[model samples]
Target: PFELSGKWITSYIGSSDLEKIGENAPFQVFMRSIEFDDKESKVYLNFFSKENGICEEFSLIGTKQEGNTYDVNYAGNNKFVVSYASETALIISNINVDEEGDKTIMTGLLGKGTDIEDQDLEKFKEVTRENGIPEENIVNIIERDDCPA
Candidate 1:
C-alpha cells in the first residue's frame, strides 16, 4: 500500500476540457506533513521557485492516495481530482494547480511507498536509475514521509 506521504514534485500539463497548461511546464511541489514516525493524513500545495529554492507553502487543501482518488478545493471553489494516471499511468491521481487556478490533472509520479519493507528504498533507487536522476535525488523520495522543518 503506497500511502501518499512525501515531498512530491508535480507539474501541470494542459488539457482541452480542463483548464489547459503547457507541455513540460515547471513543477510545483507539495510537501506532505507525514513523518518517519507517523502517518499524516493531509497534504498541501504551493508555489515553488526552483530558481530561488523557495517553497512558498500554501494551505493544507487536500489529500491523495496511490490507488485511491480524491478531489481538492482550489481557487474560486473549483474542484479537481486525480482522475487518471500521472507520469507512469499507474492509476494514481492528484490535482494540477496553476497560478490561474486548477488547470491540468497530472498523474502522481512520486508517492510515499509505505507498504514495502525498508520503505521501498530499493524501488526508489530503481526508479531514479530509470529516470536518469542521480541516486541521491531519491533520498527525498525515500526519506521518512515528512518535510524537514
Candidate 2:
C-alpha cells in the first residue's frame, strides 16, 4: 500500500483529468512486478471493491527523482511514468498511450500510501503538461461515462 508497484486497472476517470488520462486510455492495465519487489505487486495494490463489485489493480511503472523512468508499455499502447506523491508517497501520474487520438483516460488520487517507479518520467510528463488539473479547482475526476460508480 506504499507504492503503485503492481497491476492497476482503470475504474474511474472523468473529464477533469482527461488531459493526461485521455491520452493513455486504459480500461484495464497491468504493472509488472519490478525487480526491486520480488513479491507480486498485486498483493498490495490490488483491491476488491466489495461495495462496487470490482477488482482493481495497479503496478509500478517507475519512480521519481531517483533516475530514469521505466520503459514500460500498456495494452492500449499507453506509456506510464512511474512517480511518487510528494516525497514518501509512491504514485503514478500522467499516464499516456503511445498512439495518437486515444482519448481514453483514468486518474485516481490513490490512497495515502503507495510506492512508484521513476524510469518513465518523460512520458509521464508528456501528458501531464497538457492535462494536469490546476490546484485551485480540483474536482471530481471520474466521469460516469468512462467509469461507473
Candidate 3:
C-alpha cells in the first residue's frame, strides 16, 4: 500500500482485543507515513495513536527481509502480517503476545481519506471475520479531530 509517500487516515479497524479498538484505545492509530531507506535495508512504520487523549507519535522499524517484507520484534516476540493490499486499500493484521500470554489480534483497514470505497470495507470485514473478530468489535475511526499533523 506504500506505493507513494503521503499521509493516510484510519478509515476502519477491528480487533479481537476490545480495548484496542475503543474510542480512545491505544491502538486506534492513524497511519502517517511509510519511510523506506533505499540505501539501507529498512522499512519504518510511522504513525500516531490516541493514547489517553494525547496524540503520541510512534515509529517502528523493520529490517527488510525483501522489497515487500520486514521483520520486527514485539517485546520478546510478535508478528505482523499483510492480509491484503492495493492502490487505495490496505488490510493488515498483527499478533502480539504479551508477557502474560495475552494475544492481541489487530486488523485494520486504512484508506486515502475519511471516505473510502465500499469494497475496501468489504474486504476488511472478511479479513476480520476470518481472524475471529466480530462485527461489534469493528469500529470506524475516520474522525481526525485530535489527529496529529
Candidate 4:
C-alpha cells in the first residue's frame, strides 16, 4: 500500500443522520485539510475544523488493525477505514462514538487539489450507501468552502 502523505482537501462528507453532518449541524464542519502520514503501521492525522466562524485543529495517531483498518481516538473512539487512495483521490469511512457520546458513521472524500475524479466521487458515495447513509445526507463542502489559514 502507498503510504498516504501530505494535505488533502475534505471535498465531501456524509452521515446517516442529518443531525450530525448536515447543514449548520455540529459536525457539518469546514475542514481546511486532512493530512495523512503513514509510518508503516500507524497512520498520523492532522486537520483543522471550522464552525460558527471559529477554527480548531485536531490531531491523532491511528493504530493499524486488519488490512487498511485502524483504531483512533479524537471525537471519541473511532474505526478509521481507508477505502481508497491515490495521488489525486482518497476515500475514508469512519465509525465512532463522538465526544458527546453519540454514535456516528461518517464518510469523507478527500482530494489532493481542488477536484476529485468522478470515479472516486461515486465510489465514496457507494461507501456511504453501504453504511446505510441516505443519499441526501451527503454534503458537498467543496462548493461552499470558506476556510482560512
Best by TM-score: 4
Please estimate how well model 1 matches the true structure, expressed as its whole-model Cα lDDT: 0.35
lDDT of 4 by residue, 68-139 (tens): 788887657889787878767788888878778888889988887576689888888898899999889899
Model 2 lDDT per residue over 18-87, tens place? 3433323343322223233334221222322211434344443422222433334444443333444432
Q: Tell me the alpha-carbon RMSD of every candidate.
A: 10.0, 9.3, 3.0, 2.6
> Using lDDT as the measure, what is the rank order of every candidate, best first?
4, 3, 1, 2
Error of 1 at 138 (Å): 23
In order, what lDDT does every prediction score? 0.35, 0.34, 0.73, 0.74
Name the runs in model 3 displaced over 4 angstroms.
Answer: 1-6, 36-39, 64-69, 73-77
Candidate 1 residue-wise lDDT at 71: 44
Which ranges of candidate 1 are over 4 A from the true structure? 11-14, 17-42, 46-56, 63-67, 78-108, 111-149
lDDT of 1 by residue, 50-116 (tens): 2244434444455543444344554333333433322222212334565666454333234333332
Worst lDDT run of 10 residues, candidate 2, spans: 42-51
Best by lDDT: 4
Runs of candidate 2 with Cα error greater than 4 angstroms are: 1-67, 86-88, 98-108, 112-131, 134-149
- Positional deviation of residue 130's Cα in model 4 after best superposition, in angstroms: 1.5
Q: What TM value does model 1 have?
A: 0.33
Q: List the candidate 4 regions with Cα displacement exceeding 4 Å.
A: 1-3, 23-26, 29-40
lDDT of 2 at 79: 35
